[PDB]
């Protein structure tokens, strides 16, 4: 059955993405004297982790590794409704397991927040929702543009183009809203550590931006 | 109409480029205790933002996202005068809108200069004009060479080649003149914050270098 292989790839791709990506966010200076945060380290690991799982699993499951990307594909009629229910379930379970493994191997002195995304204290939930909506709009627009079969001018690696789109979103909004861009990436650590503050903006925000980018490309720019 | 889709893509591409690129320049240590400037973070975000909007909109509008690039295209007879009047207006509006959104979501404590380009105090306006002319000459030469249809030896991603050309210009001249390389990138924040010092070199500099690169390639090297 080709269906169960695609669902298993979504679980496995999301597990590795969350473990390696969240591991790079660990502060190794401890709670006593925290080390300066290296924004380039976090941005590249998140971006290059997506570029790798798209390369690995792109031909097996489609390489979504994002509940917001999966929702956009349903709206534009690229996957079935039943098919997309299992990707969302698999993506969430993979993130939960990936963060669970990170918590076990990390010494208790440096676990900290375990990479849970939080909105800036001086930034309202209204502004945090808007930031998540824009960095996710440009991520899903790149996916549709790169993977458009009518184009004849797409050159280079499609997986690496998508990876650099994730990185620039992180280089911008790590200090604003955590630069989630992914509902399942935020769901994982929250379940483990039990941090549920302003968690509704990481579902409405990314999903709203994903639907606009998919609908705007498929129905307005390149119909 | 295919024209209004190209003008709309130039407005939207320039909006996202300005918001994400200028956001990476925010100093989150505040005006009290500024944090050290990370030059690689700023260079990569500017470079990877251009590589992404070329990938997204390259087949829709031509992927100029630069008033200096559009002027070079007109001189070499690649777009009409009427077509290029609307791209420059759309690019300028997108820069204004993109910088305005950044100012709304950014706390007043860290807004600072909002990414406005400024010439070094000890560097004369004559030197600043020359610096802008050289980093823009090599950027427009890359665009013409990568997009040359007579070539048969171009390999890899054309969008990614252009992005790394924007990065090296930033790795050099951030501390000299701010590394504009783009008249509309400097026009945006200046309108919002009202900082208009030495603003004529960010139009004369980039435009002269772009025309030299376009004319030299199209009429001397590869006619």
């Amino acid at each position, epitope marked *: 059955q080709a269906f169960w292989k695609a669902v298993t790839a979504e679980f496995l791709a999301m597990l590795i993405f969350v473990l390696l990506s969240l591991g790079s966010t660990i502060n190794w200076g401890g709670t006593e004297k925290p080390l300066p945060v290296d924004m380039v380290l976090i941005s590249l690991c998140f971006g290059l982790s997506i570029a790798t799982m798209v390369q690995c699993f792109g031909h097996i499951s489609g390489g979504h590794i994002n509940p917001a990307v999966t929702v956009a594909m349903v709206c534009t009629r690229k996957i079935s409704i039943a098919k997309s229910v299992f990707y969302i379930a698999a993506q969430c379970l993979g993130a939960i397991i990936g963060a669970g493994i990170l918590y076990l191997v990390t010494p208790p002195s440096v676990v900290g927040g375990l990479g849970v995304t939080m909105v800036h204290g001086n930034l309202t939930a209204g502004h945090g929702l808007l930031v998540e909506l824009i960095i996710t709009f440009q991520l899903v627009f790149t996916i549709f543009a790169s993977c458009d079969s009518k184009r004849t001018d797409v050159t280079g690696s499609i997986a690496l183009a998508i990876g650099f789109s994730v990185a620039i979103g992180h280089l911008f909004a790590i200090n604003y809203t955590g630069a989630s861009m992914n509902p399942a990436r935020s769901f994982g650590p929250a379940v483990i550590m039990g941090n549920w503050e302003n968690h509704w903006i990481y579902w409405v925000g990314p999903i709203i931006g994903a639907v606009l980018a998919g609908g705007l490309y498929e129905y307005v720019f390149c119909p | 109409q295919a024209f209004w889709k190209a003008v709309t893509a130039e407005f939207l591409a320039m909006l996202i480029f300005v918001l994400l690129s200028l956001g990476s320049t925010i100093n989150w240590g*505040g005006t009290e205790k500024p944090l050290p400037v990370d030059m690689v973070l700023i260079s990569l975000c500017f470079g990877l933002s251009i590589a992404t909007m070329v990938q997204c909109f390259g087949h829709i509008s031509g992927g100029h996202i630069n008033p200096a690039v559009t002027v070079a295209m007109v001189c070499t007879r690649k777009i009409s005068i009427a077509k290029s009047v609307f791209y420059i207006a759309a690019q300028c509006l997108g820069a204004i809108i993109g910088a305005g959104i950044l100012y709304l979501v950014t706390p007043p404590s860290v807004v600072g200069g909002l990414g406005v380009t400024m010439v070094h105090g000890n560097l004369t306006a004559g030197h600043g004009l020359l610096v802008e002319l050289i980093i823009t000459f090599q950027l427009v030469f890359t665009i013409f060479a990568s997009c040359d249809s007579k070539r048969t030896d171009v390999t890899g991603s054309i969008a990614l080649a252009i992005g790394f050309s924007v990065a090296i210009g930033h790795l050099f001249a951030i501390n000299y003149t701010g590394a504009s390389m783009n008249p509309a990138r400097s026009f945006g924040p200046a309108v919002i914050m009202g900082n208009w010092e030495n603003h004529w070199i960010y139009w004369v500099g980039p435009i002269i270098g772009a025309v030299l690169a376009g004319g030299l390639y199209e009429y001397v090297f590869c006619p």
Partner: antibody, heavy 116, light 108 residues
Framework: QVQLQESGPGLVKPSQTLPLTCTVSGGYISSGSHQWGWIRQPAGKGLEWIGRIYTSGSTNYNPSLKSRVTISVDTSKNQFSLKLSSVTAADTAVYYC?????????????????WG | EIVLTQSPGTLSLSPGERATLSCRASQSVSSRSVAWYQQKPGQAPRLLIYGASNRATGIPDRFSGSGSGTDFTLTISRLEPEDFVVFYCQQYGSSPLTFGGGTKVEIK
């Protein structure tokens, strides 16, 4: 220098709300790197935090008081207000409005100088 | 939440002696994030130390604090007639903010 002055009824029967207002002089709420919050001190006890607010309108409340506390900002008149609901005899105290320091990177509330 | 305990409950000395106050934290406090306040009975509190080692503007040099981890101390070189008032210790290394219990100083 910056100065703060409270204002309120001073005698509330049980089960109503407690409106208090703090007026700032010598400094501007909008133009600055400070938040503004409230503290109280029940008779014969220690200081207890209540909440804060920023010029952007974002607030943080004490977890034990998050349900009843409500704080708003009026930058036009340079004031911020408090609204405590379902007051009870245990809420008797001396209420202060201070200027909360904070850290730029995360936006969390630091020490509380000056006081009202 | 980090629970702060201040001992002794009351501290007695003659004028001129050295007074030392202890604020022990139930959990590690990040980046030495502790501050001290002094309240005159019937008056608004006052800020003395922030960061456990930095002194506020205009505070007499006889006030100094130090410490780290889960133990911080406030020490007064020489007492004064007006220094026999309550003292509070605050921690802001992890939300929510919490205060101490208070350490009254009385003339022996």
């Amino acid at each position: 220098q910056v100065q703060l002055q409270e204002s309120g009824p001073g005698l509330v029967k049980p089960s109503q709300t407690l409106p208090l207002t703090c007026t700032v002089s010598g400094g501007y709420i909008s133009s600055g790197s400070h938040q503004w919050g409230w503290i109280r001190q029940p008779a014969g006890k220690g200081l207890e935090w209540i909440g804060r607010i920023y010029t952007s309108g974002s607030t943080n409340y004490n977890p034990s008081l998050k349900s009843r506390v409500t704080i708003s900002v009026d930058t036009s008149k340079n004031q911020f207000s408090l609204k405590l609901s379902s007051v009870t005899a245990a809420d008797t105290a001396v209420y202060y409005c201070a200027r909360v320091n904070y850290d730029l990177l995360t936006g969390r509330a630091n020490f509380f100088d000056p006081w009202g | 939440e980090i629970v702060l305990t201040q001992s002794p409950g009351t501290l007695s000395l003659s004028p001129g002696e050295r007074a030392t106050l202890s604020c022990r934290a139930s959990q590690s406090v990040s980046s030495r994030s502790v501050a001290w306040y002094q309240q005159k009975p019937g008056q608004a509190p006052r800020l003395l130390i922030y960061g456990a080692s930095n002194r506020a503007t205009g505070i007499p040099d006889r006030f100094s604090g130090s410490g780290s981890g889960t133990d911080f101390t406030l020490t007064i070189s020489r007492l004064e007639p007006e220094d026999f008032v309550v003292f509070y210790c605050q921690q802001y290394g992890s939300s929510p903010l919490t205060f101490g219990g208070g350490t009254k100083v009385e003339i022996k």
